[PDB]
Subunit: 468 residues, 4 copies
Amino acid sequence: GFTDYIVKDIALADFGRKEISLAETEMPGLMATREEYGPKQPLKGARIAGSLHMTIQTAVLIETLAALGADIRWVSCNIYSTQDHAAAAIAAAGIPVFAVKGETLTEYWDYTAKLFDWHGGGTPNMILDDGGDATMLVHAGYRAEQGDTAFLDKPGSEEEEIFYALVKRLLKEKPKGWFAEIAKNIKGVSEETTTGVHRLYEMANKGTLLFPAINVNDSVTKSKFDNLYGCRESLVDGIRRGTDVMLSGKVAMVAGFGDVGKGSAASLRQAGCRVMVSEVDPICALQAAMEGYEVVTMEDAAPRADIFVTATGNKDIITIEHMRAMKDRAIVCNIGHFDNEIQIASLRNLKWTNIKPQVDEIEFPDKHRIIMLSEGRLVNLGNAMGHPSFVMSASFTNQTLAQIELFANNKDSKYAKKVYVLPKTLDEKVARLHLAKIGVKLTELRKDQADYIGVKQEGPYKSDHYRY
Amino acid sequence: GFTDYIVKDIALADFGRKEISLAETEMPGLMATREEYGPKQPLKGARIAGSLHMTIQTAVLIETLAALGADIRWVSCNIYSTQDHAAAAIAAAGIPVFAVKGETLTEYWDYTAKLFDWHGGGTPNMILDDGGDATMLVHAGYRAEQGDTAFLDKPGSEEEEIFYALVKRLLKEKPKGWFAEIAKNIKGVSEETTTGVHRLYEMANKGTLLFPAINVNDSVTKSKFDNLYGCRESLVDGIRRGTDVMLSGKVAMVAGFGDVGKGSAASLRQAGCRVMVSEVDPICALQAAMEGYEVVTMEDAAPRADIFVTATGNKDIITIEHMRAMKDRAIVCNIGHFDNEIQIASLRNLKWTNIKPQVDEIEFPDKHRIIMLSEGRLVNLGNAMGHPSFVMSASFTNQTLAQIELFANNKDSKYAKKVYVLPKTLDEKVARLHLAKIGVKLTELRKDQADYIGVKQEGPYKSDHYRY
Amino acid sequence: KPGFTDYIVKDIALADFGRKEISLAETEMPGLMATREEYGPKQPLKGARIAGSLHMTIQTAVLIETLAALGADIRWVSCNIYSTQDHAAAAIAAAGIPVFAVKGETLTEYWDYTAKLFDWHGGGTPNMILDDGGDATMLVHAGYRAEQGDTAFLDKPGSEEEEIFYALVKRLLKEKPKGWFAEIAKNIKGVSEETTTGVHRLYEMANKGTLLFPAINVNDSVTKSKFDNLYGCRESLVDGIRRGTDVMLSGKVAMVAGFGDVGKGSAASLRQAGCRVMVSEVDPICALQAAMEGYEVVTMEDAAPRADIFVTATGNKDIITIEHMRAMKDRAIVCNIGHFDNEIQIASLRNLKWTNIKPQVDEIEFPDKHRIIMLSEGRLVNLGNAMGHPSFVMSASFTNQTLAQIELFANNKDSKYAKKVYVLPKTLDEKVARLHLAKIGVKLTELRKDQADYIGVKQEGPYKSDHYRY
Amino acid sequence: GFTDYIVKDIALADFGRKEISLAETEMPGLMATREEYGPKQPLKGARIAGSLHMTIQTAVLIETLAALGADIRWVSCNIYSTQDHAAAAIAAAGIPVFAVKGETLTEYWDYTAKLFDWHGGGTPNMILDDGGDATMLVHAGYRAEQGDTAFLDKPGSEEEEIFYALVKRLLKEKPKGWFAEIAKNIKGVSEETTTGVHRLYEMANKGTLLFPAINVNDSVTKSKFDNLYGCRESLVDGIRRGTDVMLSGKVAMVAGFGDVGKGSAASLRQAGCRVMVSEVDPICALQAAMEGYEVVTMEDAAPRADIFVTATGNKDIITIEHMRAMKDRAIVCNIGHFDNEIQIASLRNLKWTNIKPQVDEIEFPDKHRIIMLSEGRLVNLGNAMGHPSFVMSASFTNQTLAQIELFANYAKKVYVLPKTLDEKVARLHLAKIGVKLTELRKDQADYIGVKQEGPYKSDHYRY
Ligand SMILES: NC(=O)c1ccc[n+]([C@@H]2O[C@H](COP(=O)([O-])OP(=O)(O)OC[C@H]3O[C@@H](n4cnc5c(N)ncnc54)[C@H](O)[C@@H]3O)[C@@H](O)[C@H]2O)c1
Ligand SMILES: NC(=O)c1ccc[n+]([C@@H]2O[C@H](COP(=O)([O-])OP(=O)(O)OC[C@H]3O[C@@H](n4cnc5c(N)ncnc54)[C@H](O)[C@@H]3O)[C@@H](O)[C@H]2O)c1
Ligand SMILES: NC(=O)c1ccc[n+]([C@@H]2O[C@H](COP(=O)([O-])OP(=O)(O)OC[C@H]3O[C@@H](n4cnc5c(N)ncnc54)[C@H](O)[C@@H]3O)[C@@H](O)[C@H]2O)c1
Ligand SMILES: NC(=O)c1ccc[n+]([C@@H]2O[C@H](COP(=O)([O-])OP(=O)(O)OC[C@H]3O[C@@H](n4cnc5c(N)ncnc54)[C@H](O)[C@@H]3O)[C@@H](O)[C@H]2O)c1
Ligand code: NA
Ligand code: NA
Ligand code: NA
């Protein structure tokens, strides 16, 4: 009689469980974290609201949190990233989850709000976020509840107008003071991705951040593994499953050469494309040139490339003018967190023909066409299966450790309403937990060698400013 | 009122047509062939029986042959390689096709026989074959029809048993002399893949080959493109879609370093694996070592690689003893034409658990498991979408030109009952047809330079023994 | 000029060849050349007396002439006994700049030359140090410590170079005016330090409170560490091995100890050239990076009988021991690309039979007749057996150095630099990268104001947070 | 009392011997061939005139031929490819060699002629050639000696005028009939490189080839290894030693994508360049595009590449009009056999400034400059040390087996070694690089239609 969930089809649970079992073998850091902290139950009493792509990998994270004692409600943080068999397995485990691949924007936001109506009464006391949407709902509602309401009628994108409408509906329907009630009860947020962390630092800079936050993205074992190697593996996976094109012989353009753009350019080069890159940061541009990529503007690339990928975390990267100039049936996609890297909204008066889920052909007046993937939302998660389990084990061990820090290890107020990163000893621990699986044999410093370079034999091995 | 087909779901035809249209843009060699030969209708009067993976790419080939005047019947040459939407689109175009992804081996062989019961009555007068199964049916039936039946009672596998039962059934249910009538009427066969060509030369050398044959595999623009770059793109595609594992950090073992093994090892290394290779040919082994691969035996690799790929065209490459020695949840697959590279039958008293279509977990008595892709059949086609269209345009332009040669350019018996390859002029033409699409600007020999090296400005540019 | 004799080089007649390659390097060093054009009119280094201790290569000659073009008075030595390019040294001497640098100088010569930096022409001392590896900095600090009465460390040498260095310190205490090291320390306005090993020495002193003057850590400019250490070694490690040995790399197994910036570049050098590369590491993060890049991560004991080529890239000591070398295959190649020659236990080999093949290449034979090929007697192989990093990447390193000399000498009127270790601001790090883009055809996109606001940055940069790792 | 040689510095012999010893360890095929055939003395009675880059690797080949019984005289086949310490070691070993790094074209052809004045009297009875120059001397002299002398008054290049003057000088000095006497005594030639094999097939098709020839270049274990991997290792070595430029960040243009162009493009891309390629053959062009190289014309490349390499075996690939259009201080070089891929002659009117041996800066009227390596001669051998020893062991094991075949043991006058020998060459190299070959079971061998011991592939297989 468990009914507190919304998924595509609960009957997919058995398939979901099979793939979760397979992913466990590929996620030694999460499984070792269960073994270590299971007995101590550090998350007992935690009520974690999670907003994070409802994939097989996330399901292993969710069950790890639950094995550590947490009570949980979950949604995806993108309308196309859910893996419905993973969602069904979580629902079948009796954990409230509201996540469907292909849900509407209105559904997406209504589901986010359902995180905060805790089963049995009350609110969450922890947030685990990827992209900042659950955090944003709490802050925007609190802003309005304190009487600052005009921003809710500011012009916006289609999704923004839906978000403001949600906040108005909740102010109208929930008891007065609901958002302050939520904000009081949240002990911390851990945030996974570059875009969400930027939103966190903006709030802290403005003094509006309502609770302590750990920036998980900037663990070394997250940013230089998930953002880099994860996209190296999953960008071309998304493009292949969407289009099945031959990548050898093609030219690809990647906007951005931060961690995701580095991984994305490598994904395409390794798969056979000749890759060009755009950048605004002269250091990252020089890195791209030293790695052998031609560094060009998007105006230069638009008539040249076969495949375009936005990897910036910024907005208005590929415009209608660029797409007007592209060759017929050029492929366009986005691997940054949000769908305003490409001017999708400007395309909505053109003729769209759906090819299959997450693949559309868009026809201009002059009859040239472009192939758009996942309507401009995250292509690796929308057209394929996101990053593979092993690299998500590193990200999600960080997440689990950050939840433990904020929920369990803040009894001396070592985390204020500010943004923190995990300490390097824990970053190093995350890496250590993954070495045996992939056959690494680590050397140990002898004492005199440790002394010679000024480190402890057990680490940490690098200064605070080391960049790896 | 058209019913002469067997496909999984005819309602997939619209989706198939959308992806056929997209593939046409990616297949400039086939489309240019339609434009050149369309007006001359060189295949008017041809009745082509095709046995070749019923993919979107094959659908573009089928419609090219039809555009040149051919009447067609088609089947897939593997039980897992059909793309059901491509099959549906062909059926919806009124072309008889008998091809379902996941058909049984009994169905597979019954469908092959249906090639020869031409619609309206009569037989085919051309065969287009990939792997030699349709050609084998004709030759084995002919052998038995002439009185040599004893071999039909000594089946060496379950497949051989189904095939010999089929031959016996056709000898009873088809008219007296049916196999000789087919053999009389077939003007030629063109054969796509290394294994099928081996079978052709076997028959040619023994004097049993019943009609002229063109070896398409050994066109330069087939063997050095499809087998090499096709597998480079589509092997890791199959492994990713089947398993979603992280390839960076994994050790992969490829048996064979011919054209397919070269492309397969590159597929895995480019995707991040550390790749080991086995070989029996010292030249191919030395190539592999010079390309940086460790060259080892399968016994050395068995307990330590994460991923195993057979690429030999030979048999008994990965045995039950190897599989017993493998690490838990190692991945095993085959990209050679036939499944007996892996000893699949030796596994049939173990516990098999299906994960999803074409993915199975096999458990040994000691509880270790292996993950088997497509029950050991061609992994790129079974677990993904085979090679991408652009490279198949080169293979399939060769096939179209070969059909034209045997059907229309044999008035003078230039093709006897032996195996031939297309001339280098046609090989060069196939490459030329593909240059504009990918932006190649070819240089023209000045007249002085052509003289200096002793070629014509228009080619051919290399000796007949040049290896490229 | 005939009157000028204040130098020591191998052969002054190499100056014309030196000048031709300096001219070629100028085209390849746009950052340094742009820094001249920008700051030349302003003469920010007029009055600077710069003691430089840095590999006397063609690239260093373009740095020296940049400093002089900005107004600096200069004395120079190399920071390694095998890294000098004799034609570069000759060209600097022929320009009338005191330089004491010979490829193949002895350790005793090396340290006597370092001391000549501090005997300024016309009297007095330097007032700036530009250091690579910390040796000039160490001479001032060791002498100061001893001169203040703490001499115990001088009597306990534990390597040949250490005993030579300690004997130099004693000699200078004996021969110079009393208080000489304190007078040097008082006059040095700052040191800028190029390399990971030297910067470690600096932070050790700053943490003990013994650092005597402000220091800028140039190694940890993004446009030094993530370019010179990485791409420089990617280009010049295999160059050194090829010139020393002319072996085929395709088909060989290589072992790289360390997967920091130099080890990353070294492993890529060898893989790109065709080797199958194995890596060792002590840091689990760096080990996981190496495994993710496809390298087998093993211990040196596992690698010793397996690999054809060994490269130490750690900055640490005792990486390749006599036990490892005894276990190696016959005619295995061994070399070092970290700053100092104690990564390989070279001293443990000195009673074996050494057969010189050619400069910086030796065959070492064990009693059992097993042989190894040793490059540059375990000293930096890229500089010893080849020409070090190529000019273009050194332009990024040396533009940072020039900017750091301007900071310490000209921009410390308010004492913003105390006696501790600083890095250059990110806007200067970014400027260094900007100066190198046009030469290699990079077209940089301009952020619009709405895009810059969206990611919380100014259109003119800096584009990244302080803790961004690139 | 031996002085029948010309080397730059005989004092380099000890250095040459040390590097020959090192190369022996790296040349397991040559050394295994010495071990197997030394005691058989298959080349006893052979008098081999060799014309092949006088490198450390060639010294190991020479001493292998001698260990098989051969009497030898040797020259280099390029004026800048000799390694003087290798030449000195061969001289010190008592083998006539005439080879100096930097010898002039006049010296080059005088030295080639010395091959044929055998020590003790008589002529050679075998040729081992790389590029066909020794072979061409015999055939041109034979042609003229049979009365057809007018062509010798009509050269097309400075080198051909020197060559023709040599032929005239030999016809004047040597006994009447000398070229026919040489031609009668030469039992065969083995020819190493694509350009030389092109010359042989020209002569065979015109019906003028005077003796059997083995095309060593088209052994699989030569063309698919030396030309490909050898250039992959040694092209960038040459460019680095000549210029010391940073390759990451630069654009490089490679003309040709045959075996040498494939290896050359890979050399540059693996070293960090962004590589463009030209081709005339649509199949090779399509291969380059599918390997991810931009395929362009030289006119497209001229204003924008930083580095240009010719790898065609053809002529007039980089013209003065291309070089006029290049950026200031672009690097230009040639890895094909002959210097006429670049229009060096047309540059001789401009200002040249020597930087160091084999590196020159050439200044145009408008003051832009280009950097020319080895005056357009083979850059890997002129600016560095040619291919490394291990891959030359494969090429030179083929050469040794070919000399045995021609001397001691078809229909076509130019032929290739049989696949069983090609396979043997590869097998000899496997243990040193740690390869473990799998052995077919009898049923597996039958399944694929081969003998367990090979050959494993059809004669048309392209590898
Ligand atoms: N799809 C995934 O699985 C995945 C993985 C991790 C992060 N992300 C997302 O990817 C995005 C990028 O993240 P990141 O970690 O690489 O950030 P980053 O800050 O490291 O890199 C972004 C780069 O974009 C560049 N840039 C900004 N504006 C540009 C412009 N107009 N043109 C060209 N370049 C521009 C920046 O200079 C910067 O170097 C974020 O939205 C992040 O949340 C996605
Ligand atoms: N899946 C596809 O899309 C695809 C594409 C082209 C060809 N094929 C098939 O792939 C197979 C291989 O074709 P190919 O063109 O590479 O053939 P190939 O003859 O070029 O190469 C096969 C290699 O296997 C080696 N080999 C044979 N027995 C071996 C053993 N016991 N252990 C290790 N190595 C062994 C051979 O020496 C040979 O080099 C054939 O069955 C062919 O029909 C599949
Ligand atoms: N030759 C050159 O041109 C050049 C270029 C830049 C720097 N350097 C020198 O190279 C050295 C390395 O510099 P870096 O910037 O890479 O430093 P780094 O700190 O980034 O890397 C050193 C790495 O060595 C590892 N390590 C330490 N002891 C080890 C051991 N016993 N076994 C295996 N790994 C071990 C560390 O964990 C570390 O990751 C320094 O001496 C530096 O001064 C040389
Ligand atoms: N330097 C070395 O050590 C070395 C090694 C092996 C051979 N070689 C020499 O290299 C040359 C190339 O040999 P190969 O084996 O690669 O020959 P190849 O016939 O395999 O390749 C030459 C390529 O050049 C192309 N080509 C001809 N003219 C062209 C033009 N005008 N523009 C662009 N491309 C053109 C051809 O189409 C052909 O594909 C020969 O002279 C050979 O003797 C040099
Ligand atoms: Na996944
Ligand atoms: Na240099
Ligand atoms: Na060499």
